[PDB]
Coordinates of C-alpha atoms and ligand atoms in Angstrom, one line a residue:
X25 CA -75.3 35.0 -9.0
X26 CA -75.4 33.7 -12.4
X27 CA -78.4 31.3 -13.7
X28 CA -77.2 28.6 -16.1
X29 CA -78.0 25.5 -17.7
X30 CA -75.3 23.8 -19.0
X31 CA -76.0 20.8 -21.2
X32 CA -73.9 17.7 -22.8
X33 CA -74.9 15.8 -26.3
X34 CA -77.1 12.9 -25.2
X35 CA -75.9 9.7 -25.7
X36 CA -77.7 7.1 -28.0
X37 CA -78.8 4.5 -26.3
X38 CA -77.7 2.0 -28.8
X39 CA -73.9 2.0 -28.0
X40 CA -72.0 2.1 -25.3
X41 CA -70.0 5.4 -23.7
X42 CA -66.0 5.4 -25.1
X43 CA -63.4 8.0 -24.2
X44 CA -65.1 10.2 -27.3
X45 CA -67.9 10.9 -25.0
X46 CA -65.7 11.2 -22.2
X47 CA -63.7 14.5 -23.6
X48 CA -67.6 15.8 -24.1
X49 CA -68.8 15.6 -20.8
X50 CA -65.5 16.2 -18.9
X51 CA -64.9 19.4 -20.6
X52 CA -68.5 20.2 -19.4
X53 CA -67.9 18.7 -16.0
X54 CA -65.0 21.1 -15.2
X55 CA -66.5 23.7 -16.4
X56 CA -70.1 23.4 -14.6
X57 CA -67.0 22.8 -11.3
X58 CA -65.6 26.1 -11.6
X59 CA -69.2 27.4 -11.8
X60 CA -70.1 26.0 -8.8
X61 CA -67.2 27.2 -7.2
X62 CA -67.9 30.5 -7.9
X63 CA -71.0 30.8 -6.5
X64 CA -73.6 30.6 -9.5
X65 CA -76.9 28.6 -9.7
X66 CA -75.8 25.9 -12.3
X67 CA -78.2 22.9 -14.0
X68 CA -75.9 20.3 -15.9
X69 CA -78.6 18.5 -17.9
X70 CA -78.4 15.5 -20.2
X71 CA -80.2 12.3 -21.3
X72 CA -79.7 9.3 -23.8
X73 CA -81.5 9.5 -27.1
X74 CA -83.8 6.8 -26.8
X75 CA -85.8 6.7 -30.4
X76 CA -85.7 5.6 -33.9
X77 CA -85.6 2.6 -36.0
X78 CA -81.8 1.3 -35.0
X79 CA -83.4 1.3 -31.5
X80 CA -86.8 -0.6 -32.7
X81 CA -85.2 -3.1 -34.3
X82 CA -82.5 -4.0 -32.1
X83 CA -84.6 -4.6 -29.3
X84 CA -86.8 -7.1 -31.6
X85 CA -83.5 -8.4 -32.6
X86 CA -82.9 -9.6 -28.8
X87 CA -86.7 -10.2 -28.2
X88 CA -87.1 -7.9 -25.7
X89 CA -89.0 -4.0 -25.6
X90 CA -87.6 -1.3 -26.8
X91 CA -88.1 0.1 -22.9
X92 CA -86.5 -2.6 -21.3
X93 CA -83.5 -2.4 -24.0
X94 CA -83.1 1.4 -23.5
X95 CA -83.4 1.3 -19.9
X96 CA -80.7 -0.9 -19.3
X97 CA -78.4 0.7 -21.4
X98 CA -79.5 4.2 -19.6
X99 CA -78.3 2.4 -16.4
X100 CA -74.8 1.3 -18.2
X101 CA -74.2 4.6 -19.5
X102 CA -75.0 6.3 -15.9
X103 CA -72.9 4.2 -14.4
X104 CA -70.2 5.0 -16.5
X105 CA -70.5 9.2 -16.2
X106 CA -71.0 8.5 -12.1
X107 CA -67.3 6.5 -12.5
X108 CA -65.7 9.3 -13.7
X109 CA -67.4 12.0 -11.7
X110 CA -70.1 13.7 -13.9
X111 CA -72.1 15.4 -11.6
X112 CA -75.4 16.4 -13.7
X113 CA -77.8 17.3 -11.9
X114 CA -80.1 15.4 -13.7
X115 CA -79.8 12.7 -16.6
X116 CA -83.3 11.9 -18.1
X117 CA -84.1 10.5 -21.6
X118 CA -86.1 11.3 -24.4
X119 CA -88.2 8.6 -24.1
X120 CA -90.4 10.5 -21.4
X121 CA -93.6 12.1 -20.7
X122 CA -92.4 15.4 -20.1
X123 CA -90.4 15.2 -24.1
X124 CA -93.9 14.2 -25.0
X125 CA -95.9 16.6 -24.0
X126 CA -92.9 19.2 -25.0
X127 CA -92.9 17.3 -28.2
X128 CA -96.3 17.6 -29.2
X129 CA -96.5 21.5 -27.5
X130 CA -93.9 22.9 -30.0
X131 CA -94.9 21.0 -33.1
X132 CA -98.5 22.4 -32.0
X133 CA -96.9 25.1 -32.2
X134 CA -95.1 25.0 -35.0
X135 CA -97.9 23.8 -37.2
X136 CA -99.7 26.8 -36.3
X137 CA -97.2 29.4 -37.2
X138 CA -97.1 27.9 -40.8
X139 CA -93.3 26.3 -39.9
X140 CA -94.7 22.9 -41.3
X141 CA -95.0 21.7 -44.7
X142 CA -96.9 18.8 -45.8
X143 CA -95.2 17.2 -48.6
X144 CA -94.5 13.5 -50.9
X145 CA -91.7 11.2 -50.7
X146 CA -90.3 8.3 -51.8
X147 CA -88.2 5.8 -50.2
X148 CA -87.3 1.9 -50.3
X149 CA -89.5 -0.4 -48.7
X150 CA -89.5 -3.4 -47.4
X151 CA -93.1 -5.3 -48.3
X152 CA -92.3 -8.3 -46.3
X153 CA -91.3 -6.5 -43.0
X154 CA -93.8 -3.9 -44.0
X155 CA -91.7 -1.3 -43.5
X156 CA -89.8 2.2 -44.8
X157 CA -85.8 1.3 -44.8
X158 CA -83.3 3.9 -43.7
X159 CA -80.6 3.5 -45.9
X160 CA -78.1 1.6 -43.9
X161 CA -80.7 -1.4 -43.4
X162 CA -80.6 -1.7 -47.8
X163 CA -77.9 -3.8 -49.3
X164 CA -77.3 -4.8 -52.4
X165 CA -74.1 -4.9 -55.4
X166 CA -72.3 -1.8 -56.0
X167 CA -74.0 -0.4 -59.4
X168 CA -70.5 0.8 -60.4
X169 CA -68.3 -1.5 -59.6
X170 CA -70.6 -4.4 -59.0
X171 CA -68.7 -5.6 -55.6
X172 CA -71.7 -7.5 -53.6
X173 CA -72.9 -6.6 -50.3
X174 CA -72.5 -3.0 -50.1
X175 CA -74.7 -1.2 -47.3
X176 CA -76.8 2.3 -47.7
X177 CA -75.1 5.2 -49.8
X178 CA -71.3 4.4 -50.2
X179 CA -69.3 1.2 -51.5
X180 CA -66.4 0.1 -49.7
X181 CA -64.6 -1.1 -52.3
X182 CA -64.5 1.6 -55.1
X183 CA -65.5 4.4 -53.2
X184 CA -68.0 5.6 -54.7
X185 CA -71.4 7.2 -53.3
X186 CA -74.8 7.1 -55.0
X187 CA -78.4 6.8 -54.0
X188 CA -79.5 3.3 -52.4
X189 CA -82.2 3.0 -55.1
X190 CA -79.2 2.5 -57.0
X191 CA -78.2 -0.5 -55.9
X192 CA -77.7 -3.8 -58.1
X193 CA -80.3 -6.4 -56.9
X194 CA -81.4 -4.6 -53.6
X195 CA -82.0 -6.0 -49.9
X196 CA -83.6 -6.0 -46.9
X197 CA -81.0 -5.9 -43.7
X198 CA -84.0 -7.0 -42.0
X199 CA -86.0 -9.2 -44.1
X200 CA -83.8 -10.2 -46.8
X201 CA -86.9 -8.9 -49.2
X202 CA -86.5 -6.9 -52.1
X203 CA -87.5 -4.1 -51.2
X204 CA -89.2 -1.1 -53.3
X205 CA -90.2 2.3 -53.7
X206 CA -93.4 3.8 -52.0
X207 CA -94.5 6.8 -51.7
X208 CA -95.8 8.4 -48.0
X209 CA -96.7 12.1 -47.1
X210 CA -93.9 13.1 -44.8
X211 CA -94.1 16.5 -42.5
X212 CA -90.9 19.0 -43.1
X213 CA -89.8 21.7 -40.7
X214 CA -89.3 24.9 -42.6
X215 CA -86.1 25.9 -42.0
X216 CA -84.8 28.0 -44.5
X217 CA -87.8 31.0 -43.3
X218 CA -85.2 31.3 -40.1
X219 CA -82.3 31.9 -42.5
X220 CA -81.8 36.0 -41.6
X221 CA -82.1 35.5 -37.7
X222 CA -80.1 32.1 -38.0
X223 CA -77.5 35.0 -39.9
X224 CA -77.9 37.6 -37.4
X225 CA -76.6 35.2 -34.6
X226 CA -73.7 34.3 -36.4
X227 CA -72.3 37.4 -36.9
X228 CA -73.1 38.3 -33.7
X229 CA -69.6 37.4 -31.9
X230 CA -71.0 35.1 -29.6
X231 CA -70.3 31.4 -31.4
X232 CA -66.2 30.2 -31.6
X233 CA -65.3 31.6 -35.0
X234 CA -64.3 28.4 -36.7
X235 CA -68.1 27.5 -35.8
X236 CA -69.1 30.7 -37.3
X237 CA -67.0 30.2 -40.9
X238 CA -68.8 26.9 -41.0
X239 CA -72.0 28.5 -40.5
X240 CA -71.3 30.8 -43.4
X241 CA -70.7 27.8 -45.7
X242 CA -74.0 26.2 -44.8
X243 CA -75.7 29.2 -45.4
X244 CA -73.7 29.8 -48.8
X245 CA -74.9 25.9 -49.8
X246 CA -78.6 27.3 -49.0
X247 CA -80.4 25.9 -45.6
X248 CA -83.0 23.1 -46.2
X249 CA -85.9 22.2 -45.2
X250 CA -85.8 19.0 -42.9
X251 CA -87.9 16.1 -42.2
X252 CA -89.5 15.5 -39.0
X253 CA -91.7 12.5 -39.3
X254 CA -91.6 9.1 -39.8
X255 CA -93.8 6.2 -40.6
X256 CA -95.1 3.8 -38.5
X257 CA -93.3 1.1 -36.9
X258 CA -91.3 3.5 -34.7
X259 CA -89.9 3.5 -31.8
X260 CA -90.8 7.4 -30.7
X261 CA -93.8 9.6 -30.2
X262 CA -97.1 9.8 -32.3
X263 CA -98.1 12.6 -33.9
X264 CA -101.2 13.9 -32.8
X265 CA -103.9 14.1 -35.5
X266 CA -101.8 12.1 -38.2
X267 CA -102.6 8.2 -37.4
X268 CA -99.4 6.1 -38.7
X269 CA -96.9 8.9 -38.6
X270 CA -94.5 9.6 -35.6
X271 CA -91.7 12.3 -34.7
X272 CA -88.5 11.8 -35.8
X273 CA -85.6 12.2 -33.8
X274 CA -84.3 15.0 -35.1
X275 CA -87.6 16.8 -34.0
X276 CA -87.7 15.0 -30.2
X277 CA -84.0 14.6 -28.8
X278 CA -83.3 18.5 -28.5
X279 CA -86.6 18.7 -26.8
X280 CA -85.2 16.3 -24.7
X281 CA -83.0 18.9 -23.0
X282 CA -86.2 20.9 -22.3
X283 CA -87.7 17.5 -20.8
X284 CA -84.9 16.6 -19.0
X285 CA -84.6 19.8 -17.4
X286 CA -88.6 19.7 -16.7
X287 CA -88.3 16.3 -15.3
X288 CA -85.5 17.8 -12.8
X289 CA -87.9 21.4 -11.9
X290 CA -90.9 18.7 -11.4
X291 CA -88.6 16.1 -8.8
X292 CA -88.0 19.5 -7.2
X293 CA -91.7 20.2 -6.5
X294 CA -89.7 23.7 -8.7
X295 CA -92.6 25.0 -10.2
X296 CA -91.3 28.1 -11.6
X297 CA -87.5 27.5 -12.8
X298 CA -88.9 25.4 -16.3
X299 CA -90.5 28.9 -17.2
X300 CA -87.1 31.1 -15.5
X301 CA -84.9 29.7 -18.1
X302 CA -86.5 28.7 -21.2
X303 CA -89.1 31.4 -21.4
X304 CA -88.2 34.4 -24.0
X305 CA -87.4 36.8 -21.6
X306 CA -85.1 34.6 -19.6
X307 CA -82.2 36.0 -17.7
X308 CA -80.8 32.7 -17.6
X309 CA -78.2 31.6 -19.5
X310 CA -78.0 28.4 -21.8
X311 CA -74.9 26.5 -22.9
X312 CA -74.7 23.4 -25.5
X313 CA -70.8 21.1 -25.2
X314 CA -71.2 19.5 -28.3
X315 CA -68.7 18.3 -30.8
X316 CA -67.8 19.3 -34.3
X317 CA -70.2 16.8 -36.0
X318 CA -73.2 18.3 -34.2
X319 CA -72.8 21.6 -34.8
X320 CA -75.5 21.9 -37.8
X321 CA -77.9 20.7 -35.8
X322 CA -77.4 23.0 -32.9
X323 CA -76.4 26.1 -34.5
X324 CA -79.4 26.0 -37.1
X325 CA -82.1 23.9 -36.7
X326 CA -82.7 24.1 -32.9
X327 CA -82.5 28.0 -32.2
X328 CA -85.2 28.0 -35.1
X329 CA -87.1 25.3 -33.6
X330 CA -87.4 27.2 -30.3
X331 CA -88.3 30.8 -32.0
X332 CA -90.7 29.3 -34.3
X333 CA -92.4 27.9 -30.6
X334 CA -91.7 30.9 -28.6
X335 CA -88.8 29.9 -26.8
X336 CA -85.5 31.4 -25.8
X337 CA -82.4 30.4 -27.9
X338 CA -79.3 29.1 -26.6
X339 CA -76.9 31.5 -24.8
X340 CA -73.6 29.9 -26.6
X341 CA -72.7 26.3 -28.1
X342 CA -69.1 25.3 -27.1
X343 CA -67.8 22.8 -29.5
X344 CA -65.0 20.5 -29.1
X345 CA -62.7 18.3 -31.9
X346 CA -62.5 15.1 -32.3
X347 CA -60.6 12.5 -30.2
X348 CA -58.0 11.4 -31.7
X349 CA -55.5 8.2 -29.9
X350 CA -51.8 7.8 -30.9
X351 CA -52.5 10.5 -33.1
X352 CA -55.5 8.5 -35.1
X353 CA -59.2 8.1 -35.1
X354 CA -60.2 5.0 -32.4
X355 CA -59.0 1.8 -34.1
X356 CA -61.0 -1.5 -32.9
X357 CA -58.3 -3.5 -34.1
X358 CA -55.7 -1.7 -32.6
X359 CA -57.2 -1.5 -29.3
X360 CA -57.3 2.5 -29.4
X361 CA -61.0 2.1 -29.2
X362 CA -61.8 2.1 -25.8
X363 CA -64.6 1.7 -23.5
X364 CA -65.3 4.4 -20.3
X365 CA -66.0 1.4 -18.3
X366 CA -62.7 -0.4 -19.9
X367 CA -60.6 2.9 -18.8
X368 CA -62.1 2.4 -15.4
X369 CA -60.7 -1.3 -15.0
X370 CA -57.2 0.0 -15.5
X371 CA -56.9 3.9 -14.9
X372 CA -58.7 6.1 -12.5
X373 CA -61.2 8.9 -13.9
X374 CA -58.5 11.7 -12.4
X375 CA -55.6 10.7 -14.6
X376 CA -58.0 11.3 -17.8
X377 CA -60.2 14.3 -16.8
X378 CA -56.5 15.9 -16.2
X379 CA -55.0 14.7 -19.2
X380 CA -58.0 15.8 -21.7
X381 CA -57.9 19.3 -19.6
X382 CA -54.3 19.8 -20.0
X383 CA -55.0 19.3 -24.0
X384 CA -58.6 21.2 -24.4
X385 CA -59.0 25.2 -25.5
X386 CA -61.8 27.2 -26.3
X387 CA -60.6 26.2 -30.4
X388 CA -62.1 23.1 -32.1
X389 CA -59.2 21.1 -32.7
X390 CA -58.7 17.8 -32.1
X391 CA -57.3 16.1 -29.0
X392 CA -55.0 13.3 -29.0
X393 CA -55.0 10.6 -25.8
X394 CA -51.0 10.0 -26.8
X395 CA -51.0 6.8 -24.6
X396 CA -47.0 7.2 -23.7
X397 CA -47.4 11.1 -22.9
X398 CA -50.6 10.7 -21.2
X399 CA -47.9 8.0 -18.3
X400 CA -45.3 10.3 -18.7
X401 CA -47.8 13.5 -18.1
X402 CA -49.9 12.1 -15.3
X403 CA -46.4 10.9 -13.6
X404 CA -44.6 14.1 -14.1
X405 CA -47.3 16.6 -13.4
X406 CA -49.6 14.8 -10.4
X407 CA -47.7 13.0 -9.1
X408 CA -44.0 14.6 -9.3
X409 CA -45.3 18.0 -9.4
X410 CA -48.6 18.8 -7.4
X411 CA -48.9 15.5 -5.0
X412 CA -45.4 16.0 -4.3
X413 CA -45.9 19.2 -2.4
X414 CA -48.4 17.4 0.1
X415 CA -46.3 13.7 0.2
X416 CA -43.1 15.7 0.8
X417 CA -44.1 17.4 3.3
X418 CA -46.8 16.3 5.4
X419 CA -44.7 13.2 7.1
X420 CA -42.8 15.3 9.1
X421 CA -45.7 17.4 10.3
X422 CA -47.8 14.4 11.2
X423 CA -44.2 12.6 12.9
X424 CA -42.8 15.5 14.4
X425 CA -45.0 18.5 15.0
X426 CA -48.1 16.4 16.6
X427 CA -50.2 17.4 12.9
X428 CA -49.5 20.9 13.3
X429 CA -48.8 23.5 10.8
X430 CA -46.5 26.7 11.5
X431 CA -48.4 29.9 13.1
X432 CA -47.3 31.6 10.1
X433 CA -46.1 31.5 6.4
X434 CA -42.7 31.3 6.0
X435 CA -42.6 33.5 2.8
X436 CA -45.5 35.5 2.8
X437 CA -44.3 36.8 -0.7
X438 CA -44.9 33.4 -2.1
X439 CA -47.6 32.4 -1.3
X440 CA -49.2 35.9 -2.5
X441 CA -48.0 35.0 -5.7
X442 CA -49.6 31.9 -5.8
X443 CA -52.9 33.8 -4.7
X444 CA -52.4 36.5 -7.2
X445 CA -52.7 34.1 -9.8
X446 CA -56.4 33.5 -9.5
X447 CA -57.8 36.0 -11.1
X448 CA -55.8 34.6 -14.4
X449 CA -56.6 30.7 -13.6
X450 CA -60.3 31.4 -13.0
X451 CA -60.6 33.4 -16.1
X452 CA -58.6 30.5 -18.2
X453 CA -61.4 28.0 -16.2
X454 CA -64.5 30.7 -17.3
X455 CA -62.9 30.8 -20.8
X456 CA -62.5 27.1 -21.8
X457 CA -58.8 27.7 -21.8
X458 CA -58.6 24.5 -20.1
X459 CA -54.8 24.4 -21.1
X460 CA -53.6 27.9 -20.4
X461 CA -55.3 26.7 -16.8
X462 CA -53.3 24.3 -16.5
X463 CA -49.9 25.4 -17.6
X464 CA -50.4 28.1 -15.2
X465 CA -50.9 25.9 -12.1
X466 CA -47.7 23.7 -13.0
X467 CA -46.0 26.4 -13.1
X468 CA -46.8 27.2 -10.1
X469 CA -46.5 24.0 -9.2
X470 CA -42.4 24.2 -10.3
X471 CA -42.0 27.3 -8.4
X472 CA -43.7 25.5 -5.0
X473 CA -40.9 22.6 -5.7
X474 CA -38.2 24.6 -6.1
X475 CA -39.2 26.5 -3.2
X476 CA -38.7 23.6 -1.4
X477 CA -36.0 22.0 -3.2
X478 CA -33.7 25.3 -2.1
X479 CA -34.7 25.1 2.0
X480 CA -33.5 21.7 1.4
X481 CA -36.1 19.8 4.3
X482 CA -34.0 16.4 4.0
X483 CA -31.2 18.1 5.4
X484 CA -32.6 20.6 7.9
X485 CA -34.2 17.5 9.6
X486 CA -30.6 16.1 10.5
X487 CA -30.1 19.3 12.1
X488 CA -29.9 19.9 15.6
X489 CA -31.7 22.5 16.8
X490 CA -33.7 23.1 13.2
X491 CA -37.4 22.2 14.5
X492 CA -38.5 25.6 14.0
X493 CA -37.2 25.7 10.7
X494 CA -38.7 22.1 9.3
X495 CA -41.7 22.9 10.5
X496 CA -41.8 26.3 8.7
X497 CA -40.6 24.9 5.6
X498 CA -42.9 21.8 5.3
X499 CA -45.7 23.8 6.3
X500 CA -44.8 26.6 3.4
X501 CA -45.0 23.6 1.2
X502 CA -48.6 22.6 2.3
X503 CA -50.0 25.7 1.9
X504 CA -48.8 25.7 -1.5
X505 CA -50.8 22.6 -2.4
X506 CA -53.6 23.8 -0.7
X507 CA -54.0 26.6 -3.1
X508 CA -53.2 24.1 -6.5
X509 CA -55.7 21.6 -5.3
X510 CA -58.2 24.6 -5.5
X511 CA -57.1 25.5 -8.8
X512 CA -57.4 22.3 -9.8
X513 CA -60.6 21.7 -7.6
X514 CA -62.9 21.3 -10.7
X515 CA -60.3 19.2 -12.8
X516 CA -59.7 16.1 -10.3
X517 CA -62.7 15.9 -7.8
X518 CA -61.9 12.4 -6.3
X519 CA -57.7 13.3 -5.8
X520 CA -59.7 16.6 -4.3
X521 CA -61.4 14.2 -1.6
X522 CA -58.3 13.2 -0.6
X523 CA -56.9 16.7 -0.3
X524 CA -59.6 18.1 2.1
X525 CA -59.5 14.9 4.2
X526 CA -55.8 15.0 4.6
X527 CA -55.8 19.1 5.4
X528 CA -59.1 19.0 7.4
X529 CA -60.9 22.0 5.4
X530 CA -63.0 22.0 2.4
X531 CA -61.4 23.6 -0.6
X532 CA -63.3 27.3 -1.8
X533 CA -62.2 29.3 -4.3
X534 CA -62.0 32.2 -1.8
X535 CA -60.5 30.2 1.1
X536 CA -57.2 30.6 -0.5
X537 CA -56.8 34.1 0.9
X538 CA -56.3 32.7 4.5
X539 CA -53.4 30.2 4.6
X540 CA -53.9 27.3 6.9
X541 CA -51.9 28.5 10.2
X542 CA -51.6 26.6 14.0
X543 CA -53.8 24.0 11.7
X544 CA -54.1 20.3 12.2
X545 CA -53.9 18.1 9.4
X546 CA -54.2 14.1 9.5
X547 CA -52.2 11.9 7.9
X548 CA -52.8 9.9 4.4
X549 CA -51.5 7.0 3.0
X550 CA -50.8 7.3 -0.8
X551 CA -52.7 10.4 -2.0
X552 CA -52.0 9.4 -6.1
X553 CA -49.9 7.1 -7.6
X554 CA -47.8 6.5 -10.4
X555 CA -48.6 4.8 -13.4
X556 CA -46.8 2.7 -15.9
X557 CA -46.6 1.7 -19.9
X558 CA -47.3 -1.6 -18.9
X559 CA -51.0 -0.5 -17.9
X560 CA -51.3 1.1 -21.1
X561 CA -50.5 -2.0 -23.0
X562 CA -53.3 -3.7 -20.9
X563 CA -56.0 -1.4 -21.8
X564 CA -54.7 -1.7 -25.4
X565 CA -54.9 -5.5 -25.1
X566 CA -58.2 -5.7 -23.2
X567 CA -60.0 -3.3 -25.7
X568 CA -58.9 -5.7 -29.1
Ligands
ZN601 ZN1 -68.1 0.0 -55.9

């Protein structure tokens, strides 16, 4: 009965999705799943950040617009998310009318309620280009160790970090030009006049409590104000009333969660669910996945971006680690770096929406794609473990009983322990215990096989006169994977297809309390196979 908006970190539209973006939005995925399941109204929003300078001048780099560049990198990443089962219910972009006019609405906004300050900087410029240079686009020699051809902040060679301006004989990424400093009025949001609210949330219980320490350090250091303009040419949204100056992206791509959703209510011909869940007095409630390195930006300057404009505040953010492969970051050269649409060519989405599950909690820690375990795991868990209950089984039903399952359980007692266990399972789901989930369904999953292993099936069926029995036992069995494929419902949607084709019934939540009796199930050919380290290596090889 539950209203919800559930949201993923956009994208940038500059890069293409890789499996750190996948643990995002599959964590989110089977989470928005179970909601479903249960019966609440859910919205799974997201959108690629489409803005900025990177963005500009790449696209002049390929001679092409910035809107053609951005849409056809919005069409790679969709593609990607739809491979691996994503199911938003919308996917927008910042680079929209509705973030526009939602854009320009709460700067109005907060410009009026004395939230923006006017002031002076200076920053390296590029007089041949003719314009202001983020700091990766300067290069120049090291001014401590003079190694040439260090980029932005940070040399690569000594280590050490210092201001751009810094820099031994400075230039232009874009230009080669020397650039120099100029000065431009730049528009600052005040964030340090939400400091006591921001405080109030954070003690407040709701937020993971290694999110919450952070917070307190960022507090400690002192909150800042933060820019949210920048100078003309910009890929992005003017600023109404200040000729030459545009949003920056910090300002725009949150908004873009608003738009996105705005987009979806307007598609609808929904004229009242934009106001329903972002208005102060919502009943809604709103949820941020994001990971560890966003958590600034979502915990702090958002919710006071959206009180300072009248908005509601998020419900809760849920923030995941890092990935991690073979126990490292993603290494290009090592071909641990890997493409979505890379996995795709190898692996099915299923094996690494369960592997990432089996790993993820409600804690930010980081998860590690352990290549070996994640063969030995998928092997030993889908296909030895829960598949086995249905490709055990459902041969001799089809070849001997006509299809047919047995007009009653064979041990009732069972099977209500497998129902019993819902309330724990669904709670683990609601949770973001993703891995107490799952270590509770293969555990059931060991007792269903060991059910079976003890009536012994391969030797009843050389038995004369043991019909009754086979069919009794075999259909026990499918009953038991009919209630883990529920549980596991929002975890592997496409092996889930397969499951309610072969047993001829949709999988509910609550269907699990009437066991499929005098039933008739078809047969299926492979329902999930097994994998090997040879695979892996060709992933590894393919993404070098
Ligand atoms: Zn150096």
């Amino acid at each position: 009965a539950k209203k919800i908006l559930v949201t993923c970190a956009m994208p940038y539209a500059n890069g293409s999705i890789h499996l750190g973006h996948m643990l995002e939005h599959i964590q989110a995925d089977v989470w928005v799943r179970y909601q479903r399941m249960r019966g609440h109204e859910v919205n799974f929003i997201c959108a690629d950040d489409a803005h900025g300078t990177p963005i500009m001048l790449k696209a002049q780099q390929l001679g092409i617009t910035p809107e053609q560049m951005i849409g056809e990198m919005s069409q790679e990443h969709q593609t990607d998310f739809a491979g691996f089962n994503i199911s938003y219910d919308n996917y927008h972009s910042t680079h929209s009318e509705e973030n526009r006019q939602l854009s320009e609405l709460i700067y109005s906004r907060l410009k009026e309620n004395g939230f923006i300050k006017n002031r002076t900087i200076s920053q390296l410029y590029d007089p041949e280009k003719g314009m202001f240079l983020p700091d990766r686009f300067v290069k120049g020699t090291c001014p401590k160790c003079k190694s040439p051809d260090q980029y932005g902040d940070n040399c690569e060679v000594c280590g050490a970090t210092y201001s751009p301006t810094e820099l031994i004989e400075p230039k232009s990424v874009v230009s080669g030009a020397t650039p120099v400093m100029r000065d431009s009025e730049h528009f600052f949001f005040d964030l340090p006049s939400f400091s006591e609210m921001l405080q109030a949330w954070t003690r407040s219980g709701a937020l993971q409590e290694q999110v919450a320490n952070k917070m307190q350090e960022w507090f400690e250091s002192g909150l800042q104000q933060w820019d949210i303009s920048r100078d003309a040419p910009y890929f992005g949204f003017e600023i109404p009333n200040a000729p030459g100056k545009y949003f920056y992206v910090w300002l725009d791509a949150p908004i873009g969660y608003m738009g996105s959703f705005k987009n979806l209510c307007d598609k609808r011909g929904d004229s009242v669910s934009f106001d329903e869940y972002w208005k102060k007095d919502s009943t809604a409630e709103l949820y941020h996945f994001i990971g560890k390195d966003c958590v600034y930006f979502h915990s702090l300057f958002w919710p006071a971006m959206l009180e300072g404009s009248n908005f509601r505040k998020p419900s809760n953010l849920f923030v995941h680690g890092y990935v991690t492969v073979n126990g490292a970051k993603m290494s290009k050269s090592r071909g641990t770096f890997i493409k979505a649409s890379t996995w795709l060519n190898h692996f099915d989405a299923d094996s690494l929406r369960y592997y990432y599950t089996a790993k993820l909690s409600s804690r930010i820690d980081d998860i590690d794609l352990n290549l070996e375990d994640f063969v030995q795991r998928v092997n030993a868990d889908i296909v030895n473990k829960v598949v086995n209950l249905a490709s055990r089984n459902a041969g001799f039903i089809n070849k001997r009983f006509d299809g047919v399952l047995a007009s009653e359980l064979a041990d009732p007692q069972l099977y209500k322990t497998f129902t019993d266990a819902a309330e724990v399972i669904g709670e683990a789901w609601e949770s973001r215990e993703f891995g107490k989930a799952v270590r509770e369904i293969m555990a059931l999953a060991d007792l269903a096989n060991r059910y079976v292993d003890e009536q012994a099936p391969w030797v009843v069926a050389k038995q004369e006169g043991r019909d009754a029995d086979l069919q009794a036992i075999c259909s026990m069995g499918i009953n038991l994977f009919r209630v883990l494929m529920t549980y596991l419902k929002p975890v592997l949607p496409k092996l889930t297809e397969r499951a309610e084709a072969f047993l001829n019934t949709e999988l509910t939540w609550d269907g699990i309390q009437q066991p499929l009796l005098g039933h008739k199930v078809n047969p299926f050919k492979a329902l999930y196979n097994r994998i090997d380290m040879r695979q892996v290596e060709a992933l590894v090889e393919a993404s070098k």
